[PDB]
């Protein structure tokens, strides 16, 4: 299964939730409509119900470099970001575990394929920081 230091971890599923719609008052860019889009992040428990992702004390969205100040930091669940843009792009979402337990770079794809869509990612989380272990208890076994 896992090996070495990675044995002392548990897995959680986080769900990234994306929404987007066209802003008609914003002029299209080269005929492409400008859309308002939003990303949020939740945690899933052992039953698959959505609970606040309190296991992170910080989330940073690393946006495409066409945005001003493309690295956007949020500290409260659900770490909701909102922007306007003309194009889809892969972006990295850095999530920072409580108690400096570690940064995880989760691959997201911002796209306009649907009005809304959800994507799940499995992350490994260590069990050696008491406050994080205690918080992890709310979303499933540890």
């Amino acid at each position: 299964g896992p090996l070495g230091s990675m044995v002392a971890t548990v897995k959680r599923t986080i769900r990234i939730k994306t929404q987007q719609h066209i802003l008609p008052e914003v002029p299209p860019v080269e005929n492409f409509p400008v859309r308002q889009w939003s990303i949020e992040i939740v945690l899933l428990d052992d039953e698959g119900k959505e609970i606040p992702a309190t296991i992170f004390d910080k989330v940073i969205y690393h946006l495409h470099p066409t945005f001003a100040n493309p690295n956007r930091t949020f500290t409260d669940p659900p770490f909701r970001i909102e922007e306007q843009g003309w194009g889809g792009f892969p972006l990295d979402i850095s999530v920072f575990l409580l108690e400096k337990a570690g940064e995880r770079k989760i691959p997201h794809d911002l796209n306009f394929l649907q009005e809304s869509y959800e994507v799940e990612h499995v992350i490994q989380i260590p069990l050696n920081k008491p406050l994080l272990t205690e918080e992890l208890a709310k979303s499933g076994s540890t």
Binding site: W86, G88, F89, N111, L113
Partner: peptide, 7 residues
Amino acid sequence: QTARKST
């Protein structure tokens, strides 16, 4: 809906 940027 398939509009995308570069990298």
